[PDB]
UniProtKB/Swiss-Prot annotation, chain A:
NCBIfam families recorded: PRK05327.1, rpsD_bact
Organism, as annotated: Mycoplasma pneumoniae (strain ATCC 29342 / M129 / Subtype 1) (Mycoplasmoides pneumoniae)
Similarity-based family: Belongs to the universal ribosomal protein uS4 family.
GO terms of molecular function: rRNA binding; structural constituent of ribosome
Protein name: Small ribosomal subunit protein uS4
Record's keyword terms, sorted: Ribonucleoprotein, Ribosomal protein, RNA-binding, rRNA-binding
Keyword Transferase appears in the UniProt entry: no
Subunit-level organization: Part of the 30S ribosomal subunit. Contacts protein S5. The interaction surface between S4 and S5 is involved in control of translational fidelity.
Residue ranges constituting the S4 RNA-binding domain according to the UniProt record: 95-156
Keyword Protein biosynthesis on entry: no
From Swiss-Prot, chain B:
GO molecular function term, any single one: structural constituent of ribosome
A GO biological-process term: translation
Organism expressing this protein natively: Mycoplasma pneumoniae (strain ATCC 29342 / M129 / Subtype 1)
One Pfam short name: Ribosomal_S17
Protein name per UniProt: Small ribosomal subunit protein uS17
Gene name linked to the record: rpsQ
UniProt subunit comment: Part of the 30S ribosomal subunit.
Alphabetical keyword list: Ribonucleoprotein, Ribosomal protein, RNA-binding, rRNA-binding
Cellular component terms (Gene Ontology): cytosolic small ribosomal subunit
Function: One of the primary rRNA binding proteins, it binds specifically to the 5'-end of 16S ribosomal RNA.
InterPro entries assigned to the protein according to its UniProt record, in alphabetical order: NA-bd_OB-fold, Ribosomal_uS17, Ribosomal_uS17_bact/chlr, Ribosomal_uS17_CS
From Swiss-Prot, chain D:
Protein's name according to its UniProt entry: Small ribosomal subunit protein uS12
Species assigned in the record: Mycoplasma pneumoniae (strain ATCC 29342 / M129 / Subtype 1) (Mycoplasmoides pneumoniae)
Reported function: With S4 and S5 plays an important role in translational accuracy. Interacts with and stabilizes bases of the 16S rRNA that are involved in tRNA selection in the A site and with the mRNA backbone. Located at the interface of the 30S and 50S subunits, it traverses the body of the 30S subunit contacting proteins on the other side and probably holding the rRNA structure together. The combined cluster of proteins S8, S12 and S17 appears to hold together the shoulder and platform of the 30S subunit.
Keywords: Ribonucleoprotein, Ribosomal protein, RNA-binding, rRNA-binding, tRNA-binding
InterPro entries hit by this protein: NA-bd_OB-fold, Ribosomal_uS12, Ribosomal_uS12_bac
GO cellular component: small ribosomal subunit
Pfam family, one: Ribosom_S12_S23
Annotated TM spans: none
GO biological process: translation
Protein family according to the UniProt entry: Belongs to the universal ribosomal protein uS12 family.
Curated annotation (Swiss-Prot), chain F:
Entry keyword set: Ribonucleoprotein, Ribosomal protein, RNA-binding, rRNA-binding
Name of the protein described by the UniProt record: Small ribosomal subunit protein uS8
Recorded GO MF terms: rRNA binding; structural constituent of ribosome
Organism ancestry: Bacteria, Bacillati, Mycoplasmatota, Mycoplasmoidales, Mycoplasmoidaceae
Complexes and interactors: Part of the 30S ribosomal subunit. Contacts proteins S5 and S12.
Pfam families reported for this sequence: Ribosomal_S8
Entry superkingdom: Bacteria
Entry GO CC: ribonucleoprotein complex; ribosome
Gene that specifies this protein: rpsH
Family, as annotated: Belongs to the universal ribosomal protein uS8 family.
Cross-referenced InterPro entries: Ribosomal_uS8 (IPR000630), Ribosomal_uS8_CS (IPR047863), Ribosomal_uS8_sf (IPR035987)
rRNA-binding listed as a keyword: yes
Function recorded in the entry: One of the primary rRNA binding proteins, it binds directly to 16S rRNA central domain where it helps coordinate assembly of the platform of the 30S subunit.
Amino acid sequence: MKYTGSIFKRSRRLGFSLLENNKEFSKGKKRKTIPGQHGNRFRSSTMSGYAQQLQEKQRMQYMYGITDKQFRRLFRLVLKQRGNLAVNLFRVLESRLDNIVYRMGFAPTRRSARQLVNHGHVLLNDRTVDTPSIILNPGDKVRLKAKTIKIPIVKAASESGVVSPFVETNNKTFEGTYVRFPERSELPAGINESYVVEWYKRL
Amino acid sequence: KRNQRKVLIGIVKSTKNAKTATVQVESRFKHPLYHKSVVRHKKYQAHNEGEVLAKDGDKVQIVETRPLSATKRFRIAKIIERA
Amino acid sequence: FEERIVKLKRISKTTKGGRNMRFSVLVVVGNRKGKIGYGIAKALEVPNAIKKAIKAAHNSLHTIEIHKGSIYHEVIGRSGASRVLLKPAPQGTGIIAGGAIRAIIELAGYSDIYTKNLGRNTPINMIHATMDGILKQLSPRRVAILRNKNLNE
Amino acid sequence: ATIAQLIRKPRKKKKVKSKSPALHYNLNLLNKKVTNVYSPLKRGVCTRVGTMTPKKPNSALRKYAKVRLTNGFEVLTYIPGEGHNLQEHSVTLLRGGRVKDLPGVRYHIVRGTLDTVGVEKRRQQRSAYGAKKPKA
Amino acid sequence: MVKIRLMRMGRVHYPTYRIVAVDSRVKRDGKYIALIGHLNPALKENKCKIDEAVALEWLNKGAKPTDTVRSLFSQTGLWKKFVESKK
Amino acid sequence: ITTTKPIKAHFDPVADLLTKINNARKAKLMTVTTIASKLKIAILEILVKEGYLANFQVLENKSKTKRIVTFNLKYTQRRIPSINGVKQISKPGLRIYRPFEKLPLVLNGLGIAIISTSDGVMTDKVARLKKIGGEILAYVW
RNA sequence: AUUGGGCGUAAAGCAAGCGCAGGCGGAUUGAAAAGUCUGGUGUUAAAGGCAGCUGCUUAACAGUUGUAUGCAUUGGAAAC
RNA sequence: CAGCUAGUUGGUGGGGUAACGGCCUACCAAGGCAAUGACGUGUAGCUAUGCUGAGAAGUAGAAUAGCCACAAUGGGACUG
């Protein structure tokens, strides 16, 4: 299963918004307690190192909608080269095609953005692709296939959106590019790459 | 003409057999795993062509040649004085 | 100053008519810049024991020196038949060690390191051995001073 | 000890033994001989089925089977689950695994095989004890 | 005839023959003596570069090429550097 | 001169020299004596030129029979020795031989190892300079 | 447990001695060069491992180029 | 598992083999191997390699490739 049905259940327990900030943005008296009958008081009485390593892992990967072996493969790929392991890892986790679509703001949610990629509504480098696990390099153009523009949602998405500094796009022409490699501080700070990278004694 | 030869100084045991003598060589090699330096011995056969009578305790050399017989495969080429 | 505990132990001495349950705790104190100390104390309750251990550790502190965030020469810690090894890891590998070893090295403001547990695994002996191995580190500038080859030799 | 001594007598490994040897040996007909090819799990035909008591720390009435493999070996076995369908010389299938409470017993019947029908009315994890998924 | 011949070292649906000099009584893609370039009959526009140095050594001391090798030697010009030198 | 004491050499020269240094370091001794040998003389020379110990004098009697060498160990005004740990790798019956590319580095270069390749005893760093390997005598740091 | 363990009380120093073969072994000089190091050449099939590149919509993968390791011969070094 | 080996070791003339050769043959001799492991029992096709490891090395010799041996079992020879 590449899709997880429930999304707010992750934001509650993990204490981190899967979206930008709208996971617990006062939606129906939004809470922060862990899901289930036992959310009364279990704050911290056995919080161990392995627990926080798992927690950081889950905050990092389900936010991108990735599975375990796929992300292990991503680690094996990023270990091939030489450089700062954490920054390179997070750059790889940022180079995914569906992630770039959200950075373009073509979809309200990353979950929605991943769906356009599968159906072929996203065209990359003049050759259409339908795989969300593409690794992109700087200077790659992205277009909306010049087809299926008349989505009542894509217009509501590309109209208003926060474009990060490390990428640039044109709203009207539906054309963008991957300008440069993002910096750690330019992304949400609730992800400590060190714990995830040092928990991998697997390889 | 890439013919070869093995410089193996040996210790002839005896010429007891008919016009044939046994040469003993103490090769030094390195132990395969424990890295120590040890020596092993193996008997070599040769035939006394007639010019010399290699008695007990002489030290000689060994050269390759055709198989003159079963288990007798090397002959004398160069000889150094007795002991 | 993170004061991350390592192993609390439930100890008790017998007495006529009852068992004097007075458990003890162990703490590690480090300023993440070179200050390191440890302290073991006992009390009847968790907070009292924790406070006593922190006071004992912070009262007796001792310094360590950092070169590129790592040990620079391999050293083995011989103490109480429980050996701990340190090695000069290259800059990319990051922190890898056991429980108590990771606690000590992380609170020492350190970085990348290579360790391997030897002998027993009782936390107090591991702490003693690791501290001994890290303080017998003889600085390159020190041997430069005590030799005639001070000029980068 | 000294290097000059281990050359004469090299070291010898411990050579630990298998946890369950019955499933490893096998023998054919037509010049029968043992070939010990470490097969994962064999089957067998039960010969004696009864109950026995466990050792000191526990207390129960555990049901066991004295099954005979495809070869001539006889091995004790524990019958898991709620009840059993062992039927006095009915063929079954086995699987390794040690039980602390029963000395000698070092095997389990895989429930869901030829005759040993799986535990009925078991809906927790449904995989061990050979249970089918109930209708939705 | 030590025969310069093609070897299907490659994956299914995507063959990749490597021109090689091997004895006639040897199976496909087996042991060989020397390697002579390769062929990729999926990529077009002169995708058959070879060594051209030791191939002449092979032909000049006895080697019968195969029909598929004919184009791979003619397009580069091996015949036009071999036939007259043969005389 | 006028040592007024009988001194003898233990055994193979490499082990004999190291034990005296280690024991003197541990007991805070300053002067020791031992029988002389050109291997030991050369290793003491390279040791003193690597700045690990004070004066050594090789002494001969009023004849050509016996030669002995006495060497003082480097100290400080605060009485801390320069020698920290000595360990011999070469050993009778365990002759160790490493090529140039496998030349060891003692405590990340902080220590000094004695490697007599072809020109007598000769330090590991100048061994890398001359890129010649051979016998490995002992680690000193 | 060669690197990488131990034998007082935890398993383990034979009851002791005479001892051949074996291992080890004082100082100095000479030669040889068997060990030791190093230079050249030959070889160590191909595929695979490692690094880079290309091609499969990207990986799995395939191809592509370099890559270790030992052996034999030859020329020197003389510290052990 | 302490002796094993009687074409077993050597020579002389001959035959035979693509060729050297106790491979065989007539004669004369009694040697050869073995504690640095012969002979015998049991097991196993060997290797490049897969897996694990940090490394020495452990592990099975999957796919594939090189070599070896076989084609119900035991022998014989023709053509080439």
